[PDB]
């Protein structure tokens, strides 16, 4: 039985690879050689956010493009007003092992992660004068690594036990569980229409899942190391992943192929965060070499360097309108780039 | 001054938040943070028995001191990706049982030494000391006569006594340190008495804190 299953899987894998190779005749390397050159983008730190006493691991940008939440391992969760550098809220946390956080696209609820294998969704807009825990959602056997709000009630949570799940606030139970990852998942991204989502795992693969169907639909491969970052294209038919092999690869949900690889023979540092621009032309990614680099999305040529971090950068968020870029490093500082 | 009535109160609220966060961080810095780690079926419960989800925190108070241990035996995941949270800890407590030189899980002591020289010689741990605990001394006493140490280590060329075997184990465990110029390894033999087990922890931390302060100030 084992031999038959292995032979069938190998034969089908070759057929899938042959089908993929049958839809690749003109690579994007030669396609985008006829375009006006893009000048260097010089980004300056417009605003600096201070107040954190520990390393920052995740952050999310609000829909208003003015409120952002930063997750730090000092036991506090801070809502930042980027326009005037003001702390709207300072949420106390029972644990100081934060690894991820999320901001609902409503302004009422805020999520958080940790090493307790539990969800940390709080409520901000309440009759009381303090932020209280709305619901403690447990049921995961793996460390929190990523979480993102879809609706005001639905949320997709990524855990360290090589699986993902969809939770409900009132019930507190996994409505749908995503299983099939051979390795632990670390990050996920949400499509603009909030219908499909793709997550990156340590198994050097990123797989596309459907929230309504609750099963893996499309599988993407080509990376040489574990994937630590992922983000959808603004159009919604493509995405990019940041792995540890110092290369950024962009995968499109339509062609089921890798378009091009962002490589440079100067840095052997992995990518922690990946974000796009408003038009999907800038793909700046936060590397481990104490700074961030901006990569062109069509020519694979660097067109700007973001420096000024005293430690490795692990946070990178872009506003909904694509007007400001916020980076967060391990030096307990946040910088806004315009 | 280009600030409205609401902004004058928003900045005041931000200032109160900043002062509260600073006070909380100052209070948290006083407490001593320790990490508990060990191999398969390691005797990590001895410390919490003497003094008293994926991570559980145990805390207890001495005369003008505070401690907070962290246990990650429930993680069961890739250690290289959640170990970032444990940087800057005062010390790492490693629990190893001497009653493993003949038990087979490949020998258990081989796995314990692999874990020890993987965690000790790590990118993220080059400034934090490691405290080593040796458990089950009585069973080692009663089993050293039945079986010798040569079962585990083929290079042993000494008498099958207790002092020589203990010294050999200690130097074998301390020989895995390739960063002796920055990290020290404390080795103690755990006893039945609760005080004899944690007085060593107190003596270790009261020196590790001093060494870290001197190194940060530039005097060491």
């Amino acid at each position, epitope marked *: 039985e084992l031999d038959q299953l292995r032979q069938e899987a190998e034969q089908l894998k070759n057929q899938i690879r042959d089908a993929r190779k049958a839809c690749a005749d003109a690579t994007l390397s030669q396609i985008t050689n006829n375009i006006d050159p893009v000048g260097r983008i010089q980004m300056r730190t417009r605003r600096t956010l201070r107040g954190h006493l520990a390393k920052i691991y995740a952050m999310h940008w609000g829909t208003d493009s003015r409120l952002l939440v930063s997750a730090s391992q000092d036991g506090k969760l801070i809502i930042w007003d980027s326009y005037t550098t003001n702390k709207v809220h300072a949420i106390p946390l029972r644990s100081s092992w934060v690894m991820t956080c999320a901001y609902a696209p409503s302004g009422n609820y805020v999520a958080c992660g940790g090493l307790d294998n539990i969800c940390s969704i709080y409520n901000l807009k309440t009759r009381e004068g303090n932020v209280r825990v709305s619901r403690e959602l447990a049921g995961h056997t793996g460390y929190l690594s990523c979480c993102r709000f879809l609706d005001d009630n639905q949320i997709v949570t990524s855990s360290g036990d090589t699986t993902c799940a969809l939770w409900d606030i009132e019930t507190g139970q996994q409505t749908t569980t995503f299983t099939g990852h051979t390795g632990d998942v670390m990050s996920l991204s949400l499509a603009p229409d909030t219908r499909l989502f793709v997550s990156g795992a340590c198994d050097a693969s990123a797989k596309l899942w459907d929230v309504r169907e609750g099963m893996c639909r499309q599988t993407f491969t080509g990376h040489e190391s574990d994937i630590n970052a992922i983000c959808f294209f603004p159009n919604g038919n493509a995405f990019a992943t940041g792995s540890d092999d110092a290369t950024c690869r962009l995968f499109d949900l339509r062609a089921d192929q890798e378009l091009m690889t962002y490589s440079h023979d100067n840095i052997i540092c992995g990518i922690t965060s990946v974000s796009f621009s408003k038009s999907g032309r800038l793909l700046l990614a936060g590397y481990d070499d104490f700074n961030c680099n901006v990569w062109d999305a069509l020519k694979a040529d660097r067109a700007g360097v973001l420096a000024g971090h005293d430690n490795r950068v692990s946070c990178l968020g872009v506003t909904d309108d694509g007007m400001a870029v916020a980076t967060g490093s391990w030096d307990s500082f946040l910088k806004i780039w315009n | 001054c280009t600030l409205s009535a609401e902004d004058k109160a928003a900045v*005041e609220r931000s200032k109160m938040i900043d002062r509260n966060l600073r006070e909380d961080g100052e209070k948290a810095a006083k407490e001593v943070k320790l990490l508990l780690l060990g191999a398969g079926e390691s005797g990590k419960c001895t410390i919490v028995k003497q003094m008293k989800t994926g991570i559980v925190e145990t805390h207890f108070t001495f005369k003008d001191l505070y401690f907070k241990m962290f246990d990650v035996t429930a993680q069961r995941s890739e250690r290289k990706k959640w170990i970032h949270c444990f940087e800057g800890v005062t010390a790492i407590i490693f629990c190893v049982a001497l009653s493993d030189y003949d038990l087979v899980l490949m020998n258990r002591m081989h796995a314990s030494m692999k874990l020890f020289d993987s965690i000790c010689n790590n990118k993220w741990f080059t400034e934090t000391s490691i405290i080593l605990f040796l458990n089950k001394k009585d069973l080692f006493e009663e089993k050293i006569k039945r079986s010798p140490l040569t079962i585990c280590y083929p290079e042993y060329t000494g008498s099958n006594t207790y002092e020589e075997a203990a010294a050999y184990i200690q130097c074998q465990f301390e020989d895995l340190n390739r960063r002796k110029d920055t990290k020290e390894i404390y080795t103690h033999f755990t006893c039945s008495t609760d005080t004899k087990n944690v007085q060593f922890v107190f003596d270790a931390v009261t020196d590790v804190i001093i060494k870290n302060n001197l190194k940060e100030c530039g005097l060491y």
Partner: single-chain antibody, 234 residues
Framework: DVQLVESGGGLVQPGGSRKLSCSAS????????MHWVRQAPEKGLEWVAY????????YYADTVKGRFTISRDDPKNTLFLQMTSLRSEDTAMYYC??????????????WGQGTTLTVSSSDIVMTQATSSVPVTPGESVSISCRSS???????????LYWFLQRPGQSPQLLIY???NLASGVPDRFSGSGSGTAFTLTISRLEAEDVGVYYC?????????FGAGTKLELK
């Protein structure tokens, strides 16, 4: 369980001292600004004093400056308005008002039940065109009050507030910042403005939208209120 009970009041001779309390419960008394808005026995509202969270900034009105002391007890969740040299002017209805200030906050959201005190015998001015409008159930009401100065600020938002004081009750906030509906406000209420002229519209009021309408501004210390927009059931 949020409430603001006020203790103290009655008949006091002129030239004395009276003790007031605002013992609060149901919410955290450590991050809400405290107000002491006073309503005259006949009509009209005015701001007396305000203390921020943590007793940082303390503000006083011109008519009560030098004789009013305001303090709060954070552990006991109690607010005090001890006064000296009482005068027949200080014969009105005293209200204890909570408020919070941040990006997206709703100040003056809750008002106390009020206490009655009786004594034996460059500020922005808000003007209302009318004080009595004959209105029937299921009709459109246009309430407008003007401001002497331009309430528009450089940040791009307007600082205008609206209130509804039902008879035998306490004032209730309706619209804050001239474009945001308060909590519990129905879809019928709305608001509009241009910096100088502000309008308030009510559509299909059946029986609950009867009372005195108050509008104020949040731009300086005095915090002057409106006059009155009493509506008659005809």
């Amino acid at each position: 369980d949020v409430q603001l009970v006020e203790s103290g009041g009655g008949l006091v001779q002129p030239g004395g001292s009276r003790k007031l309390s605002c013992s609060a419960s149901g919410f955290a008394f450590s991050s809400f600004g405290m107000h002491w808005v006073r309503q005259a026995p006949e009509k009209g509202l005015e701001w007396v004093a305000y203390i921020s969270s943590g007793s940082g900034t303390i503000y006083y009105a011109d008519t009560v400056k030098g004789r009013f002391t305001i303090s709060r007890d954070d552990p006991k969740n109690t607010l005090f308005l001890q006064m000296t040299s009482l005068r027949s002017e200080d014969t009105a209805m005293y209200y204890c008002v909570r408020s919070i200030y941040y990006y997206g906050s709703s100040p003056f959201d809750f008002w106390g039940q009020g206490t009655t005190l009786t004594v034996s015998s460059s500020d922005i001015v808000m003007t209302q065109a009318t004080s009595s409008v004959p209105v029937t159930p299921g009709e459109s009401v246009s309430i407008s009050c003007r401001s002497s100065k331009s309430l528009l600020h450089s940040n791009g938002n307007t600082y205008l507030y609206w209130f509804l004081q039902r008879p035998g009750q306490s004032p209730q906030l309706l619209i804050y910042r001239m474009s945001n509906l308060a909590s519990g406000v129905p879809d019928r209420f709305s608001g509009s403005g241009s910096g100088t002229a502000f309008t308030l519209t009510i559509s299909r009021l059946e029986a609950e939208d009867v009372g005195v309408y108050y509008c104020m501004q949040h731009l300086e210390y005095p915090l002057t209120f409106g006059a009155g927009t009493k509506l008659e059931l005809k």
